[PDB]
Write an enzyme that holds these catalytic residues in place. Structure first.
Site, PDB file in Angstrom:
ATOM      1  N   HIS A 170      -5.512   3.211  -7.652  1.00 47.58           N
ATOM      2  CA  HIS A 170      -6.531   2.375  -7.030  1.00 47.58           C
ATOM      3  C   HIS A 170      -7.230   1.508  -8.069  1.00 47.58           C
ATOM      4  CE1 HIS A 170      -9.251   6.279  -7.196  1.00 47.58           C
ATOM      5  NE2 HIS A 170      -9.122   5.752  -8.398  1.00 47.58           N
ATOM      6  N   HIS A 192      -1.715   8.618  -6.724  1.00 42.29           N
ATOM      7  CA  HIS A 192      -2.087   7.372  -6.069  1.00 42.29           C
ATOM      8  C   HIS A 192      -2.897   6.498  -7.013  1.00 42.29           C
ATOM      9  CE1 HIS A 192      -5.167  10.385  -4.370  1.00 42.29           C
ATOM     10  NE2 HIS A 192      -5.886   9.650  -5.197  1.00 42.29           N
ATOM     11  N   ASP A 245     -10.450  10.099  -1.480  1.00 45.27           N
ATOM     12  CA  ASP A 245      -9.143  10.649  -1.834  1.00 45.27           C
ATOM     13  C   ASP A 245      -9.272  12.095  -2.312  1.00 45.27           C
ATOM     14  OD1 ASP A 245     -10.256   9.115  -4.164  1.00 45.27           O
ATOM     15  OD2 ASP A 245      -8.525   9.941  -5.224  1.00 45.27           O
ATOM     16  N   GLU A 271       0.827  -1.197   0.000  1.00 45.28           N
ATOM     17  CA  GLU A 271       0.000   0.000   0.000  1.00 45.28           C
ATOM     18  C   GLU A 271       0.868   1.257   0.000  1.00 45.28           C
ATOM     19  OE1 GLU A 271      -1.610   0.476   4.306  1.00 45.28           O
ATOM     20  OE2 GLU A 271      -1.670  -1.676   3.902  1.00 45.28           O
TER      21      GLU A 271
END
Length: 153
Positions: free
Chosen positions: A85, A83, A96, A22
């Site tokens: 996902h 990021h 987010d 992660e």
């Protein structure tokens, strides 16, 4: 956000590097003469530390502050964050978006599905912070004048 094809690929590779763990990634770069940011260096928020015999910049942590220090070490700063996902191809979600504390940063959303990097998108957060707006991927001008914020350590 100005970026080169080599950087873009390194971003998606860092997504595969972070996974399955992660970790997100920070965008380190210079302030272009336009006032916009160029990403020149990449660092993923995931500890990559083997037993190497050398002196440390500070320590390994890959936290924002550690990236901030590493940025200064490179004579850069954090111009954006990214990021990945496994949900929706390429756009920020509710949480987010909500966790976006820096309306002056460029947020890159990249499709990484369990290690497979598909596509990358760059988004600009509204100054009022209600939603994101899409920005196009632009390469730095084929000249690039002198920087004013860049340092050299």
């Amino acid at each position: 956000m100005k970026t080169t094809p080599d950087i873009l690929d390194q971003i998606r590779v860092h997504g595969a590097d972070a996974y399955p763990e992660e970790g997100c990634g920070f965008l380190l770069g210079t302030v272009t003469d336009d006032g916009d940011n160029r990403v020149a260096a990449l660092h993923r928020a995931t500890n990559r530390r083997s037993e190497q015999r050398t002196r440390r910049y500070e320590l390994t942590a890959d936290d924002y502050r550690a990236a901030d220090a590493a940025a200064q070490e490179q004579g850069l700063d954090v111009v954006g964050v990214y990021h990945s996902h496994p949900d929706h191809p390429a756009r920020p979600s509710a949480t987010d978006l909500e966790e976006a504390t820096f309306p002056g940063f460029t947020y890159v959303i990249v499709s990484v599905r369990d290690g497979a990097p598909e596509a990358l998108t760059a988004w600009a957060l509204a100054p009022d912070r209600s939603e994101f707006h899409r920005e196009d991927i632009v390469r730095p001008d084929p000249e690039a004048p002198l920087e004013h914020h860049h340092h050299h350590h």
